[PDB]
Amino acid sequence: MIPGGLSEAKPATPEIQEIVDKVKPQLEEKTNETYGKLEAVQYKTQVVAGTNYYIKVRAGDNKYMHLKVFKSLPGQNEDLVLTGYQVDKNKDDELTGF
Amino acid sequence: MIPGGLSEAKPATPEIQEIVDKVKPQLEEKTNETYGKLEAVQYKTQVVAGTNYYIKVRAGDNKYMHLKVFKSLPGQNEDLVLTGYQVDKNKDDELTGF
């Protein structure tokens, strides 16, 4: 529906305490100051989306094609670009990040 | 709310037939192979995801720091890049478009 939404805010995780532990040297140079005790507090997560397109197409009873087109901006059909494409495999071929 | 996965399979939309019609010459040039008639059949859509992070973590002497870290691919410690940070402000500072 809506790409780019914040997840639940967790008050501290083992990964969040690891993020501060990696960011303390870079933050210390940019702040001109030493931070005291670094303890995990509360993080959220935003997921960005894009749109990849996978098509099944009938060549005759002997052949059947898959197609793969990347799109960026909606409202322009000419922005469709072929980035992947599968062969003569049947309609039984499931379109699965091929 | 919803897991990733391909969208609904439409058995030959007017967009599906237009995508294969435009990719019929490009498929035959890239494979060097001649295909008979390509008619629309069933396509599915594909959702890519990217993950930005918004963290709070109290590293002050008496203070609280809050920073967001953008990452590309998971399983890489060098992929975790600090792009945005907050200082000595408390848990009241919400990580918002940042």
Swiss-Prot record, chains A, B:
<dbReference type="GO" id="GO:0098609">
    <property type="term" value="P:cell-cell adhesion"/>
</dbReference>
<dbReference type="Pfam" id="PF00031">
    <property type="entry name" value="Cystatin"/>
</dbReference>
<dbReference type="GO" id="GO:0005737">
    <property type="term" value="C:cytoplasm"/>
</dbReference>
<feature type="site" description="Reactive site">
    <location>
        <position position="4"/>
    </location>
</feature>
<feature type="short sequence motif" description="Secondary area of contact">
    <location>
        <begin position="46"/>
        <end position="50"/>
    </location>
</feature>
<keyword id="KW-0963">Cytoplasm</keyword>
<dbReference type="GO" id="GO:0045861">
    <property type="term" value="P:negative regulation of proteolysis"/>
</dbReference>
<keyword id="KW-0789">Thiol protease inhibitor</keyword>
<dbReference type="GO" id="GO:0018149">
    <property type="term" value="P:peptide cross-linking"/>
</dbReference>
<dbReference type="InterPro" id="IPR000010">
    <property type="entry name" value="Cystatin_dom"/>
</dbReference>
<dbReference type="GO" id="GO:0005654">
    <property type="term" value="C:nucleoplasm"/>
</dbReference>
<protein>
    <recommendedName>
        <fullName>Cystatin-A</fullName>
    </recommendedName>
</protein>
<keyword id="KW-0977">Ichthyosis</keyword>
<dbReference type="GO" id="GO:0005615">
    <property type="term" value="C:extracellular space"/>
</dbReference>
<dbReference type="GO" id="GO:0005829">
    <property type="term" value="C:cytosol"/>
</dbReference>
<dbReference type="GO" id="GO:0004869">
    <property type="term" value="F:cysteine-type endopeptidase inhibitor activity"/>
</dbReference>
<keyword id="KW-0130">Cell adhesion</keyword>
<dbReference type="GO" id="GO:1904090">
    <property type="term" value="C:peptidase inhibitor complex"/>
</dbReference>
<dbReference type="GO" id="GO:0030216">
    <property type="term" value="P:keratinocyte differentiation"/>
</dbReference>
<comment type="function">
    <text>This is an intracellular thiol proteinase inhibitor. Has an important role in desmosome-mediated cell-cell adhesion in the lower levels of the epidermis.</text>
</comment>
<dbReference type="GO" id="GO:0002020">
    <property type="term" value="F:protease binding"/>
</dbReference>
<feature type="modified residue" description="N-acetylmethionine">
    <location>
        <position position="1"/>
    </location>
</feature>
<keyword id="KW-0646">Protease inhibitor</keyword>
<comment type="similarity">
    <text>Belongs to the cystatin family.</text>
</comment>
<keyword id="KW-0007">Acetylation</keyword>
<dbReference type="InterPro" id="IPR046350">
    <property type="entry name" value="Cystatin_sf"/>
</dbReference>
<dbReference type="GO" id="GO:0001533">
    <property type="term" value="C:cornified envelope"/>
</dbReference>
<dbReference type="InterPro" id="IPR001713">
    <property type="entry name" value="Prot_inh_stefin"/>
</dbReference>
<dbReference type="InterPro" id="IPR018073">
    <property type="entry name" value="Prot_inh_cystat_CS"/>
</dbReference>
